[PDB]
């Protein structure tokens, strides 16, 4: 029985590694490669539109990698199209917020953005300081718990595979997939003596919702702005 659970762990971690966007060692190595005060000023001089366009392009890209993640989770493609959409709609952005913590450097409070690391001030042109500060605090809180790759991979699978999502057709098919992931994650946390980390997670719902709202706002108003 153990070997199957350990196989499902390795299956979820494989699915995650292939869809991670960047390798973690790449993000950690690039931490030294930091934006200059001049390169910061370049980003601060851009238009609100141009800076939101870039960030929405990266959010959109990130959501497409989570769909590739879900597609490789055993049982998810067996679900009906409606359920796949309902789960990804309700889960995708929170998996992005969680995946983002890997590209956050707690030492200097800087994030990987378009080839180098910089601080909150890199995003002044979004005129959303409170939102920026919150996504930074969130990434800081997950960074400080030292979530391994395995933990992120299993946790983000459980953010997606949730049978409580309003609008599901095959609830029982989703519960079977969720339960198997809970077994697997529970076995992993026991082995590693990390049972208690999910008590210490900051809440992500409100932040994900705002990030989704901003992405939609830019789709809706594209014709008021250049191509």
């Amino acid at each position: 029985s153990l070997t199957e659970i350990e196989h499902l762990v390795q299956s979820v971690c494989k699915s995650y590694r292939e869809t991670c966007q960047l390798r973690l060692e790449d993000l950690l190595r690039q931490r030294s490669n930091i934006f200059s005060r001049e390169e910061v000023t370049g980003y601060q001089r851009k238009s609100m539109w141009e800076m939101w366009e870039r960030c929405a392009h990266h959010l959109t890209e990130a959501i497409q990698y989570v769909v590739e993640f879900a597609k490789r989770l055993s049982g998810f493609m067996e679900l009906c199209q409606n359920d796949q959409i309902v789960l990804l709609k309700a889960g995708a952005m929170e998996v992005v917020l969680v995946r983002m913590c890997r590209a956050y450097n707690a030492d200097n409070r800087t994030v990987f953005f378009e080839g180098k690391y910089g601080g909150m001030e890199l995003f002044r042109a979004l005129g959303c300081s409170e939102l920026i500060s919150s996504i930074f605090d969130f990434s800081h809180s997950l960074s400080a718990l030292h979530f391994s790759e395995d933990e992120i991979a299993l946790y983000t699978a459980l953010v997606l595979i949730n049978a409580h999502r309003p609008g599901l057709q095959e609830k029982r098919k989703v519960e079977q997939l969720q339960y198997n992931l809970e077994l697997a994650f529970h076995h992993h946390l026991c082995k590693t003596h990390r049972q208690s980390i999910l008590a210490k997670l900051p809440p992500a719902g409100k932040l994900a919702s705002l990030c989704s709202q901003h992405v939609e706002r830019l789709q809706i108003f594209q014709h008021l702005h250049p191509i």
Partner: peptide, 14 residues
Amino acid sequence: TNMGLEAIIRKALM
């Protein structure tokens, strides 16, 4: 729910 994410997600499933 969000239509904008629905659109992104529908595209990526095909």
